Design a protein around this ligand. Structure first.
Ligand SMILES: *[C@@H]1O[C@H](CO)[C@@H](O[C@@H]2O[C@H](CO)[C@@H](O)[C@H](O)[C@H]2NC(C)=O)[C@H](O)[C@H]1NC(C)=O
Ligand SMILES: C[C@H]1O[C@H](O)[C@H](O)[C@@H](O)[C@H]1O
Length: 246
């Protein structure tokens, strides 16, 4: 399992949590020196437990599918909560069975359904450490509309940060002040599968992408990623979704 505490958190302890989150995801292979996520893991070993503690020390346990860094649901006190999707329903066979009751959230876990549910695009939702603290707090007591916002914040702060060094650094900057994610952050979240695929295709194609990946950069304008010499490949992405899951 991995644990992160908001109390006393700072850019460093957060970096250590995301490090720990990355290192908890199993891989047998590195493709261009990036850990390649497994095609599948059967039964209960498929799910990483993240113990998150708000500033008060209240806690939730989040279950993450180790093959795609996809949050499936969480446990708050004696209630489990799972997204309304088959993968999460499958996950509820394995994690948090000790929960007194189980609530299936009225949405899947994808960004589009979460945003509709939250009433805001994640462009307009501040993130950072104080926001993760809020999110953990919200998730402690069921409220499906508020939880959708809290989940968008939680996805971005833990999974998307594990997947991209740039997003981990975005959050580290937002250790004590939330701020909506940069467009570059949104571009990376949305491009992960894409990049994961083209990194893998590049092996066999001389480090060249079969199809370029359009991103937005820090300064704000589109940029086309075409091979593995690109910074986003050499420095930024930290985990590759296996093409068997794309
Ligand atoms: C691999 O990717 C790099 C970009 O990351 C390519 O080099 C860039 O592209 C053009 C020049 O051809 C310029 O717009 C950039 O400023 C270049 N940047 C750097 C840092 O060199 C490179 O051409 C690509 N190589 C292959 C074989 O596709
Ligand atoms: C859109 C996806 O972003 C990440 O992959 C999360 O882990 C998933 O739960 C889903 O929200």
């Amino acid at each position: 399992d991995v644990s992160f505490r908001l109390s006393g958190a700072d850019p460093s302890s957060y970096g250590m949590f995301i490090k720990d989150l990355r290192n908890a995801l199993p891989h047998t292979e590195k493709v261009y020196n990036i850990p390649l996520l497994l095609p599948s893991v059967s039964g209960a070993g498929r799910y990483l437990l993240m113990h998150l503690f708000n500033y008060d020390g209240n806690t939730i346990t989040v279950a993450v599918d180790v093959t795609n860094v996809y949050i499936m649901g969480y446990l708050a006190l004696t209630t489990s909560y799972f997204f309304n999707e088959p993968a999460a329903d499958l996950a509820s066979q394995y994690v948090f069975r000790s929960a007194r009751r189980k609530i299936t959230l009225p949405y899947s876990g994808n960004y589009e359904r979460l945003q509709i549910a939250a009433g805001k695009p994640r462009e307009k939702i501040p993130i950072g450490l104080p926001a993760l603290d809020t999110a953990i707090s919200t998730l402690l007591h069921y409220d499906s509309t508020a939880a959708a916002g809290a989940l968008l914040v939680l996805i971005q702060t833990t999974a998307e940060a594990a997947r991209f060094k740039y997003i981990e650094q975005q959050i580290q900057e937002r250790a004590y002040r939330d701020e909506v994610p940069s467009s570059a952050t949104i571009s990376l979240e949305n491009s992960w599968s894409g990049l994961s695929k083209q990194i893998q295709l590049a092996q066999g194609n001389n480090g060249v992408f079969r199809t370029p990946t359009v991103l937005v950069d820090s300064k704000g304008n589109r940029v086309q990623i075409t091979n593995v010499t690109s910074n986003v490949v050499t420095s930024n992405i930290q985990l590759l979704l296996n093409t068997k899951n794309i």
